Amino acid sequence: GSHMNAAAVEFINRLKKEDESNNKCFDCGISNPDWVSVNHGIFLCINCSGVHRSLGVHISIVRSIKMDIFTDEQLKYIDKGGNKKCQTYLENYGISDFIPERKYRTKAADHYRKILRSIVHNVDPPAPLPLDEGKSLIN
């Protein structure tokens, strides 16, 4: 109901006040992103959320902070992620400046999804991905 929705917004705002990079869109950098790619634990603007939608459900799961209800598991993805952790991971593999169709289909981005998922489920992470495999795209 209304209470569960309001507590979720309060949670997101805490994460935006904790890690300031959550207050800029992950892909384009504009301030006050009101959308989330849950699967990546990142914050996006309305336009970049549209780009993510065209990537398909295997790549990105998109939610609006203003308009959508969030499941408790979905909020955990954001709690264990954030813009900073994803950006650092993508930068480390040299793929952070790739356009979305390439960036989110890299082994590096796919590997980050698996890492975040494992943190959410409190299980062992996948083996570290070799740097030279990171730029290659998944099938």
Q: What are the residues binding Zn ion (CB under 5 A)?
A: 25, 27-28, 45, 48
Which residues does the annotation place in the binding site? 25, 28, 45, 48
Non-local (6+) Cβ contacts of 98 within 8 A are 106
| CB closer to Zn ion, 49 vs 129 | 49
Q: Least Å distance between CB 27 and Zn ion?
A: 5
| CB closer to Zn ion, 103 vs 117 | 103
Rounded distance between C-alpha atoms, residue 119 and residue 60, angstroms: 18
Which residues does the annotation place in the binding site for Zn(2+)? 25, 28, 45, 48
| CB closer to Zn ion, 83 vs 106 | 83
β-sheet with 42-44: strand ranges across: 42-44, 35-37, 62-64
Q: Least Å distance between CB 74 and Zn ion?
A: 20
Q: Least Å distance between CB 127 and Zn ion?
A: 32
| CB closer to Zn ion, 78 vs 129 | 78
Angle of the 83-92 helix axis to the 107-120 helix axis, nearest 10: 140
CB-neighbour burial class of residue 86 (10 A; exposed 0-12, middle 13-18, buried 19+): buried
- Radius of gyration of the CA atoms of the chain, in A: 14
Q: Least Å distance between CB 14 and Zn ion?
A: 22
